[PDB]
């Protein structure tokens, strides 16, 4: 029971085909669009604020470089923009991971309570099933740093 990701009525995230009806419904009344494609951190605005995150092409694109970018783009929209929607590009939870950083550096809940809030269990990326070691790493990475 999961798939689509949505944090509060201001932050929205997709993942699989659900990103179509979702990104479209919000598109009608959207403000900041996190186009996870390329062109590095680009700040366009076809309709309001188009954000572009540099994606990669290997395994699942390491998301350790979008920590400050995610919380800087998502927070910059909630503090002035309005609604930020992160799109996907491989039926993966990469987009939900970006919003995770926001809830971490902004809500201070670490990937533990943050991942548990953005959605329910069932949904582990990369080799990380039945394991509780990854915790202080992302914490000091998105919060402390």
Curated annotation (Swiss-Prot):
A GO term for molecular function: phosphoprotein phosphatase activity
Active site: 88
Localization, UniProt: Nucleus
Record domain Tyrosine-protein phosphatase: where: 3-144
Keyword Transcription regulation recorded: no
Reported induction: By mitogens.
GO biological process, one term: protein dephosphorylation
Record carries keyword Hydrolase: yes
Tissues where the protein occurs: Expressed in hematopoietic tissues.
Keywords: Hydrolase, Nucleus, Protein phosphatase
Any one cellular-component term (Gene Ontology): cytoplasm
Oligomer and partners: Interacts with MAPK14; this interaction does not lead to catalytic activation of DUSP2 and dephosphrylation of MAPK14.
Entry's family note: Belongs to the protein-tyrosine phosphatase family. Non-receptor class dual specificity subfamily.
UniProt function note: Dephosphorylates both phosphorylated Thr and Tyr residues in MAPK1, and dephosphorylation of phosphotyrosine is slightly faster than that of phosphothreonine. Can dephosphorylate MAPK1.
The protein's name in its UniProt record: Dual specificity protein phosphatase 2
Annotated source species: Homo sapiens (Human)
Gene this protein is translated from: DUSP2
């Amino acid at each position: 029971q999961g798939g689509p990701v949505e944090i509060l009525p201001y932050l929205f995230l997709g993942s699989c085909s659900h990103s179509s009806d979702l990104q479209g419904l919000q598109a009608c009344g959207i403000t900041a669009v996190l186009n996870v494609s390329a062109s590095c951190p680009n700040h366009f605005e076809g309709l309001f604020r188009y954000k572009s995150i540099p994606v990669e092409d290997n395994q699942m694109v390491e998301i350790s470089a979008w920590f400050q970018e995610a919380i800087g783009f998502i927070d910059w929209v909630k503090n002035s923009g309005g609604r930020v929607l992160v799109h996907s590009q491989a039926g993966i939870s990469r987009s939900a991971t970006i919003c995770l950083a926001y809830l971490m550096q902004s809500r201070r809940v670490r990937l533990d309570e943050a991942f548990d809030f953005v959605k329910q269990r069932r949904g582990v990326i990369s080799p990380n099933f039945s394991f509780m070691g990854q915790l202080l790493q992302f914490e000091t990475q998105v919060l402390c740093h």
